[PDB]
Structures are given as structure tokens and as C-alpha cells.
Design a protein around this ligand. Structure first.
Ligand SMILES: Nc1ncnc2c1ncn2[C@@H]1O[C@H](CCl)[C@@H](O)[C@H]1O
Ligand SMILES: Nc1ncnc2c1ncn2[C@@H]1O[C@H](CCl)[C@@H](O)[C@H]1O
Ligand SMILES: Nc1ncnc2c1ncn2[C@@H]1O[C@H](CCl)[C@@H](O)[C@H]1O
Ligand code: MET
Ligand code: MET
Ligand code: MET
Lengths: 257, 257, 257
């Protein structure tokens, strides 16, 4: 049966500059009054399922077991692509479109049970075809939060029926990797190079010192370091790296002695 | 007498980029510790009472009955224009400046009882003339949330004494309407044409297919559809419509066979 | 011993455009499930300790006594500069880097007891050198919120060992002052001139009327007024002042009859 998950972790691409995300929400308190709603972010680039998926990766680990991860970038709203409900190995519940959005969250804690959200009893009637995020995803997330059995949302599916996004691995060739994501607020660059395969040379060619933290080099100076995810990163001490060297997600990066 | 409304729905134009909205809030927890504060948005254009009012329209329906709708775009702060407190037909309470801000929220669920907020016992002493939003609107919203009788805020007024913003209707002439609001995050255009009066022709003249949802046309292609509010809308499938055809609120739109 | 502080007031520079601030947070609910987390703001300019400190000034007064003020602009993360935990005269608890961030908050309500956060039992193991904000500041803030004794975080220090940021006073010379902060959302200018030392002349030279509130002058017209903090301010009635006269923090301002 169901279990109370009092904490809803809410992620979308509708922004926080208008009421859309708050309505969702209004709906969620209606179903689950006791729930604590927490925004992950709503400022995922429009339709960008990959970026949303990347933002969700560290969520399962950072959040307690009584969490409903509600992911809501759904450009396929009102079409054949369904919403899915998942229970992971930590015990957390997650709800979102079966479009690859939960890919990296499930890498952190794998799927133990999944179901397609097909039952109207966990939906917000009547369902608007252009707003599945509110009427299906958010509504279902609140029902599971209130303690609804996972089985009641719809029929069981295999974990392989969950759409997964491709993630490129770094390999020893020197080690070649790529830029996965830029830390928007600061301009730091994150790579897919783990601890793990490792003054070094990074290829434009640069000689960068490897540090434990930002303040080990002078203000404005570049550095290499390992982030919280065990991956290699580039930054300027108290400055914006991608304003000096404008890299984009997907670009190659090679590290050699 | 009063009734507990545990959920505060908070809307302003002060943004979320500094502490202003959080102070409000600090004040609200002081009066009502048990209250759950939820932002509708704070990114209403400065002084734009119309935009704020549009953001509030779907709030009464989306939110449960134990909600205090706290609306806070108040360029008339410290002048003769008072704050009002309202109880609607759903049972929800709403507080804001009598400047037209609650207009469209009251269209959704009409006013059953109204009072001007004049009593200092529901205010945050001393009241700063430049911050009525915090010291009167937010403070009063928290008092009503805690269970304060509506009558205690100040003297009763007639619903007609509530300032209302004009809303232009769409009419059959072909059907002529206007652009009411642009969906900032995606670039979708919303019109005032209901379900209801309706490949069609939209006047620059365009031939657009009428769809149930975005993904019924190819990526980048334009479409016509009905939104959650039962009104006609324009969009590009996974793209920004007002970047292709830059329309602004108020502009005419005619739909013919 | 410790006391429950159920309300966490959370301030950072990591923005709300991605998951970073929400992870912090995830961590906080893990330690303190009953806690109510409230964002002050996350849109403090990168590394800008001064701006963050200014945003915190009015927080102690606006917020109740059971608040943990969690301040998190920490460019010195992973270096010798430690996190500190403070209990002020109001009874509130505050946690942040000993880099000047809590300076103006402590001006409002002075430090009664302080400790450096050195114990791992109030931290999030293992601590990432690049994320002290999450693993030390946010974790410790949640522990104190749950009721952990202030003494348990680490060794006691003197209040003078707390780094303080310099604040320039306005003086009678006519009264000379400076621009402290610009009200981002509206364009209003705040000065360091108190009530207190005061149609007036403001030096480019302008003749401005002194008003109680914005609407005492015609739309678009400039005015002088006192803000909620008892300090002199400049603005345009329903317009953006720094778009007409582009002043920056630090610039001189002289007021004479
Ligand atoms: N023009 C558009 N094309 C495709 N999808 C769109 C869209 N506008 C909004 N959405 C998508 O609609 C979802 C609501 Cl269910 C939101 O997540 C948003 O991603
Ligand atoms: N320069 C200005 N002119 C007129 N109104 C202003 C203003 N600055 C802020 N407000 C208005 O002051 C209110 C606080 Cl009570 C906020 O809602 C804001 O809308
Ligand atoms: N490139 C950089 N240089 C110096 N400090 C940086 C930084 N990037 C993030 N931080 C700082 O890291 C803290 C996490 Cl503990 C955040 O508060 C942020 O202020
Ligand atoms: C998210 S705060 C600073 C960014 C950094 N790269 C870290 O180690 O995550
Ligand atoms: C708010 S999500 C997508 C926008 C859309 N027009 C809808 O039907 O509201
Ligand atoms: C923060 S709302 C309007 C700004 C104003 N200067 C006030 O008195 O704080």
C-alpha cells in the first residue's frame, strides 16, 4: 500500500515570474493539506528535458526518504507520452513525464517499482490537454504524498520502458571528456571526468593548478578542482569562467600532464 | 466571527531578488506562526496593477477554501486609497489595495462581504507610509489567517465601492478579440475569445491549424488551441511565438473560416 | 542548552535558477523535519558579501525570536575562514561565514553568544571543500533549529573576533552622505542620511520636494522621502529613478536648504 511522503520537491520550466507554478501547488494543497512544497527550480530552459534531468540528479541523495520528487517539464503534454510514478531504492517517490526527465535521478537511486499514471482518481478533473503538469503530474504527486498506493495510479510497467537520456562517459586516451553543465550563478564549468581517472594541461591550451577550493589561487585566476559530485571542474577565483573562455555543454575537454 | 485560513497566497511587484518580500513574511509568521506562506509571484511588473490582477484570476479556483489571497502591488501606498479585506463565495479571504488588483479574482468567486482595513489592531505598528504592503496588507492577511473576525479590520463597504478594472469582451463581427496576456516563459499568446463563439484564418494574415495540444504540429510550427481558462491561444510547438510575431497586450486579433 | 527555532531564514548568492539552493534545504529537512524554510533571497550578486549583509539588516526585526538566520555567501569556502554561530539579544540564532556577512544583522540585534562551527556532529559528512554553505552553514543551521546547544557547534569566541564591514556615516557639513543601496525592483535610491539630521536641494543639482509617500507628486516626478529604516531616499513617482539619474552605491549626496 501507500506511505505518507510529507515533502514535495517541485521542478518545472514554467518559471516563477507568473502564477503557473503556484497553481500547481494550489492544486497540491487541495489534495494534500499537510504537505510541504519545496521548489527545486522553475527556471529550467523552456522544453529542455536534458537540463531539467541534470538538475534532478543530486536531489534523491540530498532529500530525505519521505519526498515526492515532482518533475514537470512536459512539452509532450496532451499526447501519447504518459506520466509515470516511481518508487526508488531510498523509498522516495517520483512523478513526471516518461520523456527522459527522471533519467539522472534514477541513476542516483534506481527504480524499484513503476507505474504509468492513467487513473482519473489521482488526476485533477477535468484534465486540460495543454496542462498535464498541473492536472496529472502535480495532482498525482500530491495524492502519493497523502498516502495513495502506487498501484492505484495505473498499470505497472518495466523499468526499461522508462525513457532514458544518453550520458557520455569520460575515457582515458591524457583523459578526454566533455562539458556537461555550466554553473549559471558563478560561471563555473562542470565536466564528466570523475575523481578518479586523474600543474596540469587542459585543452585553446591552458596550464591550470589543481586545487581543493577556489581561494587557493589569487582573485581572478583560473583553477581546476573536484566538485561535490566527484567530477572535475573549471573556475575563476571570485570571477566568471565562461565570460573569459565561453564554453557550452557538449564541448570537448582534454586533461594531460 | 473569524475562521482559520492556514494558507497564505502571496503576490507582489517587489521581486524576489532582495529581502523586501521576505520581510513581509517575517511579519506574517509573527502574527500567524502556523500559517503556510506560498508565493504566487513577486515578479509583477513595477506598479502594474492590471498584470497583477490577471495573475490572480485563476487563484481562487486552484486554491482551497482556507486560503488568504494576499495581493500587494500598491503604488498608492500612504495615500487616500485604502486596503480592503474580502470574503468570497468559496469561503476564501483576500486582502489588497482598493485599486483594481482583486478585480479578476472576484470575477472567479464574487465578494460576499467586504471591509476597508482601517483598524490599527490588525496592522504592523508603526505603519511606514511607503510600505503599506507590509504594515497593512501583509499584517492584516496574517491576522485573518490566525482567525480574526472580518468585521474587526474596519467598517463594512458595498461591493460596488471596490474598484474594478475594465475587461474587453470578444464579439462576433468572423470573431474579433484582443491579446490579453503573453505567457512569458514560453511565448504563447492568450486571447479573450472563449471556447465557444468558435484550418482557420487569423489576422498580418496566417493560416493556423486548430489543435488540442502543442505536439499535434511539427516542431517550430504555429498552432491554435484552447487553454485551461477556455480561451483561444496562439503558440509555436516547442518555440517562442512572440519572437516570430511580436504581439503586445491590447492588440487586435480576428479569427475567420 | 539549546532551544527550538522552527523558522529558518535562508539567504545566498547561488540563485534560484537551479537546484543548488534546494539541496541545501533537502539537507535541512533531513536534520530538522519540522522546520519551516523561508528564502530571504538567493539573488545576491556573486561573492558580494556587502550586498548580502545589507539584505540581512532588517531581518532580525521583521522575523520572530524562533528564527535561524542562515546566511550563505561564502567565496572563502574550504579555506581558513570559519563558519560562526550566533545568538542575538532578541533570542534569534544566526549562522554564516565569519567574513562580514552578518555585520548589519548584528547591528540591529547585537551578539550575546558566539561560537565557531568546528564540530563534525553538526555538519553534513563528508564535507565538500567547495560547498561549505551546504555541508557546514545549512547543516548547522538545521541542527540549531532542531534544538542543538550552541556550545556543541565548536569553541566559544569573543564578539570582536567577528569580522565587521565598515559602514560610512552621514555628517553635517548642509548634510553630506552617500548612496548605500538601490531598490532593484523600482529604481529607488537609499542613502545613509537618518531622519533626523534634517523644498530642498540635492547635489548635478536638483530641487526636490520632501514627501511622506510616492503619490504626493505627479506621475514620473522626483521626490525625497524617509524609508522604513528611517533613512532619506530618492525616487520617481511610479517610475525608475536610476534610469533618469544613474547613481551607484558609494556615490556622494549632499542635501541643503
Ligand atoms: N509551445 C509549447 N510547446 C510545447 N510545449 C509547451 C509549449 N508551451 C508550454 N509547453 C509545455 O507545457 C507544459 C505544461 Cl503541461 C509545460 O511543461 C511546458 O513545457
Ligand atoms: N517609486 C514608486 N512609486 C510608486 N510606488 C512605488 C514606488 N516604489 C515602490 N512603490 C510601491 O510601493 C509599494 C509598497 Cl507599499 C510597492 O507595492 C510598490 O508598488
Ligand atoms: N568561483 C568561485 N570563487 C569563489 N567562490 C565561489 C566560486 N564559486 C562559488 N563560490 C562560492 O561558493 C560558495 C559555496 Cl560554499 C558559494 O557561496 C559561492 O559564493
Ligand atoms: C554550488 S556552489 C559552488 C560550485 C561548485 N563547483 C561546487 O563544488 O558545487
Ligand atoms: C501554462 S502551461 C502552457 C500554457 C498553455 N497555453 C496552457 O494551456 O495554460
Ligand atoms: C520596499 S517598497 C518601496 C521602497 C521604499 N523606499 C520603502 O519605503 O521601503
Amino acid at each position: 500500500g501507500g506511505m505518507q511522503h510529507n515533502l514535495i520537491a517541485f521542478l518545472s520550466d514554467v518559471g516563477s515570474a507568473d502564477e503557473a507554478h503556484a497553481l500547481c501547488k494550489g492544486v497540491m494543497y487541495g489534495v494534500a493539506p499537510a504537505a510541504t512544497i519545496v521548489d527545486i527550480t522553475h527556471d529550467v530552459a523552456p522544453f529542455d528535458v536534458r537540463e531539467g534531468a541534470l538538475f534532478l540528479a543530486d536531489v534523491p541523495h540530498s532529500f530525505p526518504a519521505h519526498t515526492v520528487i515532482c518533475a514537470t517539464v512536459y512539452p509532450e503534454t496532451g499526447t501519447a507520452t504518459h506520466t509515470i510514478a516511481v518508487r526508488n531504492e531510498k523509498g522516495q517517490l517520483l512523478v513526471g513525464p516518461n520523456n527522459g526527465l527522471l533519467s539522472f535521478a534514477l541513476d542516483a537511486s534506481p527504480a524499484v517499482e513503476c507505474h504509468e499514471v492513467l487513473s482519473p482518481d489521482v488526476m485533477n478533473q477535468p484534465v486540460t490537454p495543454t496542462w498535464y503538469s498541473k492536472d496529472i503530474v502535480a495532482a498525482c504527486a500530491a495524492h502519493l504524498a497523502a498516502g495513495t498506493d502506487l498501484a492505484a495510479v495505473g498499470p505497472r510497467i518495466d523499468p526499461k520502458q522508462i525513457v532514458r537520456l544518453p550520458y557520455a562517459s569520460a575515457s582515458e586516451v591524457g583523459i578526454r571528456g566533455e562539458v556537461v553543465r555550466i554553473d549559471r550563478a558563478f560561471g563555473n564549468v562542470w565536466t564528466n571526468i570523475p575523481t578518479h581517472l586523474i600543474r596540469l594541461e587542459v585543452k585553446t591550451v591552458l596550464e591550470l593548478p589543481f586545487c581543493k577550493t577556489f581561494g587557493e589561487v589569487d582573485e581572478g585566476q583560473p583553477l581546476l578542482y573536484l566538485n561535490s559530485r566527484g567530477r572535475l571542474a573549471l573556475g575563476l577565483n571570485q570571477s566568471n569562467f565562461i565570460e573569459k573562455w565561453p564554453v557550452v555543454p557538449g564541448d570537448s575537454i582534454t586533461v594531460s600532464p
